[PDB]
Assembly symmetry: D2
Homo-oligomer: 221 residues x 4
């Protein structure tokens, strides 16, 4: 009704890393699609632009935009974005699907991506859960704080979500099942529901944060 205080009806996101039909970016895509958002799409390698033309058959997306971007590979990211900017224009944010195998990538696209957000934006970046650590969020956390500062001046917010264990995508996570305060795991939707928060206008004065969508398990520590 008047929960237009999200904005997000009509704004355009770039969703990256949306590998098969259980990829989290796929939950994020749907919660988003469902909320009104035009969306754009990056496929990282080959093929799967199929699972996709397919995939998008569940979403009501009246134009259908896909871009092979190998995040691994920089101009692959630069001509992705000027391509997109050519093709559809300005974005309000990009979800991104995250040594820096994956740190740099974020950094790169951050920077590429802002050229499309001239009035400003929101960039979400997710990690998932290998031993450890973390470190590994410490590092992550930090690489988002740095970006926060940078594009803060340009009114682009930058935040991370850290994604707990999700079944449908070591069966000793029966462990979290059983120690995470809510005694269950997360899935994609509940990940991409926080993504909606984060790209949306409600998270208005929030940037450089790491929101753990993980049933409460970080608290175990």
């Amino acid at each position: 009704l008047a929960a237009a205080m999200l904005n997000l009806e009509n704004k355009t996101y770039v969703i990256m890393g949306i590998a098969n039909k259980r990829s989290i970016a796929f939950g994020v895509a749907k919660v988003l699609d469902q909320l009104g958002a035009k969306l754009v799409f990056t496929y990282r390698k080959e093929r799967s632009r199929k699972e996709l033309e397919k995939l998008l058959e569940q979403l009501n997306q009246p134009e259908a935009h896909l871009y092979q971007i190998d995040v691994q590979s920089d101009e692959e990211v630069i001509n992705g974005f000027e391509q997109i900017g050519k093709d559809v224009g300005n974005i309000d944010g990009v979800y991104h699907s995250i040594q820096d195998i994956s740190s740099y990538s974020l950094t790169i696209v951050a920077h590429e991506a802002k050229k499309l957000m001239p009035e400003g934006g929101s960039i979400v970046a997710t990690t998932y859960l290998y031993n450890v650590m973390g470190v590994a969020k410490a590092s992550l956390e930090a690489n988002v704080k740095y970006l926060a500062l940078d594009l803060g001046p340009d009114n682009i917010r930058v935040n991370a979500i850290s994604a707990g264990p999700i079944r449908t995508l070591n069966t000793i996570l029966k462990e979290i099942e059983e120690r995470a305060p809510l005694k269950r795991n997360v899935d994609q939707v509940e990940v991409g529901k926080t993504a909606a928060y984060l790209l949306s206008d409600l998270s208005s004065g929030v940037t450089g944060e790491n929101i753990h969508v993980d049933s409460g398990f970080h608290a175990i520590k």
Copy 2:
């Protein structure tokens, strides 16, 4: 429209600490009121149940419930809540307006409050910004993680918001003005907009977190 994935239309919150017309709990009340939520109200001392019967004249709240609760004072909290439970019934969450001057209070009401959330809930707890620290979030952060564990079993989520400097409620915060990545301060609304996230269903698998609604300043560190 279909951003009924917040729930929050019709659910009932207890909003505490909603001192004058610039209190943050007052932003939270309005974002909430605006979203469909019945609300209940705690006044901590005297009088102000006026600013209130008044205050609520801006909100479309067709019943009008207020309860003097001195959070400082425990049975004041116990007969607040069984009172409320008597008077209106079950809650879906309470916003709360936070040595433990204010730590204990949270703890207490957490525990009082759950007796009203039989199918479960969401409790938000805010701090604002004295020198320091923090410590002082470290401690805060922790006292929310502990509660997270406790009421996690009962499906009540528990999270904190840490609230940056807000003008309209040392003029050296001109400092944040000028170093916080977004180069501005926060107000109530943008605080209570995150509160909405947090009590709402989008923050579904999120508990024991501290979301800094502070233009990005935590990142300065």
Copy 3:
């Protein structure tokens, strides 16, 4: 022989909080006494200046100085120290035996104590291990970092030791017995042996640190 790179032969310390014959400050006193250090002595309350005139019978301390100081009570600390400065003169450091039940105390004496260290010094401050936390070191850690800065300019080093469970001074610490990497507890001597490090010249460029003398248990986390 030439492990005069400790200094500490002849320098004068004030040892506080040296309650009975199993007090840690008592280990620190002995390791110290054994190393050559003149020592001075604070008793916090009454009596025990006995256990002491006694206690010191095990130490080869040819003068015998004791000062009732209630750390709790400030002028009790101010006329302690100008007293001492009167009575014996300049110190090279003070061991101290640590809301701020015990934080403030440190702070106070820090400040009192420096008037005696005109060429500079070393102040050690110990905590021991109630639930928790910590917080509680976070806070501690911090209150030592602040002092570090302050008296750094005046060449007084300031560090903390955090003291694990020690038997001879919940029998579920059989827990540490059994999970602390070295599979044993600490005692006083091994606490005051680090104290020697810390007041001595080897910890020369070390200040604002917290050295856990606790068989390795902090690492469990």
Copy 4:
């Protein structure tokens, strides 16, 4: 005299990474040499076994043992140590001169090295200070905590020193000069003086710690 509570007279250390005449390992070697310790020596590459046969001319080391070990290269580390164990026998500790360019190395030698410490030991590991971070101690800190646990059972202590900026080995560290609480930098000696602490018996119940020999600068944060 009776500051034989260090042990360290006669015990044998392996000192690695002792590149030229200003290398820190070189301060550690001397403080050590000066304290009575037989020492053994690893050179990582080529040549420099010269600076060394040379270098050692300042130390009173009546036997002269050197081993080319490329830490980078594992069997280079395995036949280093069984070599040594062959050649001289059991060690009491090794100083070591530290993606894991340098993390793994530590890990490796930890494990190699213990076969020589049958009654147990002490391993020190240093980092020096590139932007950052840290992370980078977070990670370091952690990789020492893990080892702490492992060889704790076998009574080998494991700790790190983190080494501030040292002139004689960006001239914007004039910055620390001027903000580090003691208003000066550290050198090698004051690094290797803490190393002595750490390998010595005074740091008896201390393991998995990170002792910043850096004039107090960590406290700036």
